[PDB]
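User: For a benchmark we're assembling, each entry needs the component sequences followed by a predicted structure for the full assembly. Here are entry 17's components. Please fill in the structure.
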Amino acid sequence: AVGTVGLAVGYGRKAALKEEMQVGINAYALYKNFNSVQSITLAKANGEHEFACVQGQKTLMGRGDIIKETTLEIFNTQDAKHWNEQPMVSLDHQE
Amino acid sequence: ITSIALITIYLKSKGYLEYVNTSHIHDLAKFMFGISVFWTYLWFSQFMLIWYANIPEE
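Assistant: Structure for entry 17:
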């Protein structure tokens, strides 16, 4: 929202497993008095990290032909031609 | 090209052309032949590239 930070908890294990599986941060040490909300100070570090990211682009370019959405009152009051429209091709001066 | 050839044939048969012979005719005949094949080439490639992947628009 604003002034808050998300932190996943549960990765920093080191006993009885290979270094390929010893990946991530634990954060359970921050669960003081079993409370999930903690006050913090955030500072920028020095280096740069590489991520195994699956998806590249974050937004949709306005391509309404991928996820068509509408509203309930449109669904209820308008014809399908105005919310679920299929593409047309020209014939002898006809669609 | 064919209209050029036809006029020179006419004029030659009427006795109005000199220094014109079958080699001039031959050269025009093979010229128009080659380029008529070229026309066919363009015709087919336009047709086939639409027919092969018939995305309904166009």
